[PDB]
Amino acid sequence: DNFNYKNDTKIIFGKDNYSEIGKNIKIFSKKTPKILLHYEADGELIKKLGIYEKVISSLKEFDIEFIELGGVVPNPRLSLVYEGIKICKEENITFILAVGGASVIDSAKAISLGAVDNGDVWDFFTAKRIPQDTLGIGVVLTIPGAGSEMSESSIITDENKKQKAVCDTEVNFPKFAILNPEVCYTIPDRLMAAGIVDILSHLMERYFTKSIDTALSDSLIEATMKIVIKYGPLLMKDRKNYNYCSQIMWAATMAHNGMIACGRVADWASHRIEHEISGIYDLTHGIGMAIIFPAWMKYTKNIRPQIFEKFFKEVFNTVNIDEGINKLEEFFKSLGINLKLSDYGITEEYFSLMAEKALGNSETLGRFMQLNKQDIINILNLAK
Amino acid sequence: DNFNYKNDTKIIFGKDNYSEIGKNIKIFSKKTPKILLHYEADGELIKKLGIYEKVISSLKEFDIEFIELGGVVPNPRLSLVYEGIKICKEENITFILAVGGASVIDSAKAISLGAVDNGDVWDFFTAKRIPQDTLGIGVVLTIPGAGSEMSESSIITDENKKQKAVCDTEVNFPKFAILNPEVCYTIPDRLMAAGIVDILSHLMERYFTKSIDTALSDSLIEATMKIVIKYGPLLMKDRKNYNYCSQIMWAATMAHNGMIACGRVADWASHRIEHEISGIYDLTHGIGMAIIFPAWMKYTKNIRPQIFEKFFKEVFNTVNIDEGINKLEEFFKSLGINLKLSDYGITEEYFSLMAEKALGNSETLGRFMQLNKQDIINILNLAK
Ligand SMILES: Nc1ncnc2c1ncn2[C@@H]1O[C@H](COP(=O)(O)OP(=O)(O)O)[C@@H](O)[C@H]1O
Numbered sequence A, B: 001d002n003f004n005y006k007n008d009t010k011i012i013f014g015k016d017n018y019s020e021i022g023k024n025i026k027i028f029s030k031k032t033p034k035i036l037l038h039y040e041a042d043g044e045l046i047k048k049l050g051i052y053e054k055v056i057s058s059l060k061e062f063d064i065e066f067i068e069l070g071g072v073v074p075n076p077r078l079s080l081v082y083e084g085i086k087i088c089k090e091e092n093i094t095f096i097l098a099v100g101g102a103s104v105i106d107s108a109k110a111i112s113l114g115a116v117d118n119g120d121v122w123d124f125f126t127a128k129r130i131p132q133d134t135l136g137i138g139v140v141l142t143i144p145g146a147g148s149e150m151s152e153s154s155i156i157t158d159e160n161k162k163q164k165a166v167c168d169t170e171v172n173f174p175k176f177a178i179l180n181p182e183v184c185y186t187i188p189d190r191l192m193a194a195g196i197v198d199i200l201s202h203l204m205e206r207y208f209t210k211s212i213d214t215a216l217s218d219s220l221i222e223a224t225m226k227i228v229i230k231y232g233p234l235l236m237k238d239r240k241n242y243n244y245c246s247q248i249m250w251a252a253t254m255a256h257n258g259m260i261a262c263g264r265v266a267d268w269a270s271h272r273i274e275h276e277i278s279g280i281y282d283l284t285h286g287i288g289m290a291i292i293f294p295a296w297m298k299y300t301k302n303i304r305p306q307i308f309e310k311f312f313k314e315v316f317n318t319v320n321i322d323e324g325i326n327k328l329e330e331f332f333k334s335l336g337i338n339l340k341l342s343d344y345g346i347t348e349e350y351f352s353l354m355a356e357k358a359l360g361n362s363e364t365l366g367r368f369m370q371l372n373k374q375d376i377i378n379i380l381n382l383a384k
């Protein structure tokens, strides 16, 4: 149980602080700054919300020249990275400002890698070369999910060969990330509820571990989980409450922090199972993790029952696993989320297909408990 | 309640990992590495403990040339910094390895500033110039206190003018810090108990705040505090227990982390009062904070009684402040620590003197509650 931790992304947390876009662009750009403004599609969202205005007002206030590059698709495309790299070498951009979510942050990270490289940037995703430098980006985050605003990962899909790939390296760390909980206000209900489930799930996947001697870490993960459980329902019924949004958005940031997960072994069983439901049905990730995770917990309740006793004691105030599992189901339901796959017209038709696709070329799946094709179908039956 | 957070010190946490001294020296040194080895006095301690051996074995295994510079005094002296700066410019040192505690880390940080500067490094402590670069240091921490192994501060005392000063800047951040809980084993009992109090106190000084809307942050600070309260007594009676030492040493690291204190206003009333007791008597910091903090809490129990209710509920399982205060006194006593100043032959003789020296040129002192000369004497009377 040894671990390393590094994370140098500067966090700018709060509201009415839109000057720090430019103030921080100057702190991390070479000499005279000339930035590239990255956003999804044609700024429809960020301009609708007023993020576009407040951004330009910050660059102007700081005399920061800038070009705009738009047109990100949810799974961002290497053809657009190739474009941004061209403009950054052509127009001498010294810094990229990602305004959006992980789809445009990942483009920002990919463009920032090849703007400084003299070769193909796909060599950095297909494991040919290990990038040693990046131009540098700052993020203006619009939705508190995934955590790409402080990760070292970038996920680009090359459509011409259809192979999606990633690149994990310490140079991908955004130089700063602007974190205003107000951006939560405009998010649609079902999207925000699923985002709450994503935070809790990210915490649970590291919490439920066969690792030992992790008491401080247990507490910190419990404390964050507990906050998501108290404030998640409140934010859902009072969507413009800055307090409620500060807790949830700060919980999500912490959820992506390996100071509180101290090299404890995460289990991705639920993620993988959910992935396959989402590959065949049009179902949002967070909603699928509210349906799958309680089923997975039921199936794995015998592995380490004490760590299940602990979870429901510290988080739901009950040493009864069954009562605690139903409380967690009730919590999901209080977010608007129906708890069964039948509810979403999903039938047992492809349970078998999804189980084999989950497993791929392996016999079992998971770390907390090793799950084979039938195990995975039993879990999908618990969730029907 | 907006805040910023940056911290890029790489944490290497664990044991039987002494290769990472050299492995990490190579990761952060320019081209060919030639390091300076910094330690207190003549390596008596670190060599006695076997840290010296295991270090040299790592530099050799990695072909790392190195000179040794010793002779740190607990309050490190600018005359020695001046020496180390000379050797770093003379002998072309590309990196400093601080092996010790905050006394030698602060020398390491000061030497690392002027090895790269073309002027006097005291200009960086006396607020004349703001350093913009540092050579770079890695720490091998021997005692989990103060947190200098991940701070941006360096505290040097110039003895020829007797003025002590500090320099706070993002370049002071160690490039890495080696954190092995085993180094806790050899620490004397009273020194380790006081170090446990220092962690709890660092957490309490930020916890007890007039700031509002800090629920997630409250939980994280509570979780850490609670761990210090559970494991601190156990580590005291089982000094070679790696688990117990991992929790406490990881609690101390987290205690110095502003991810869990989200720009909440800290109060230094207890620190300042304790400082003056320690200025007149030969009394260790941690012991003085076990005597002062319960007195300060008694005196300030009426400011924000709900945040006192909360503290003792989440940390001691009681909504009674009095019962909770006595529990905290009992906790200190379970660390070997006597709870009164009379016990240490300290009398009311200089309560008046210490109160004026605490206050300096100000009328009151503290943020949670503004404390004037008589307030401070009342608190010293509670602690007699
Ligand atoms: N502040 C916001 N308000 C409303 N909708 C948003 C906001 N931020 C993102 N979205 C929406 O969420 C959808 C998908 O989220 P995305 O931006 O890809 O972030 P992530 O990849 O982190 O989930 C987008 O179609 C976008 O319309």
Ligand SMILES: Nc1ncnc2c1ncn2[C@@H]1O[C@H](COP(=O)(O)OP(=O)(O)O)[C@@H](O)[C@H]1O
Pocket: B045, B049, B074, B100, B101, B102, B103, B142, B143, B144, B145, B146, B147, B183, B184, B186, B187, B188, B191
């Ligand atoms: N691992 C250790 N084992 C025993 N004693 C230690 C250890 N590390 C430091 N000390 C002792 O603690 C005393 C003061 O601590 P110091 O090294 O100045 O660290 P800090 O300044 O962080 O408290 C020193 O005299 C030293 O003898």
Ligand SMILES: [Co+2]
Pocket: A201, A202, A205, A271
């Ligand atoms: Co997940």
Ligand SMILES: [Co+2]
Pocket: B201, B202, B205, B271
């Ligand atoms: Co203190």
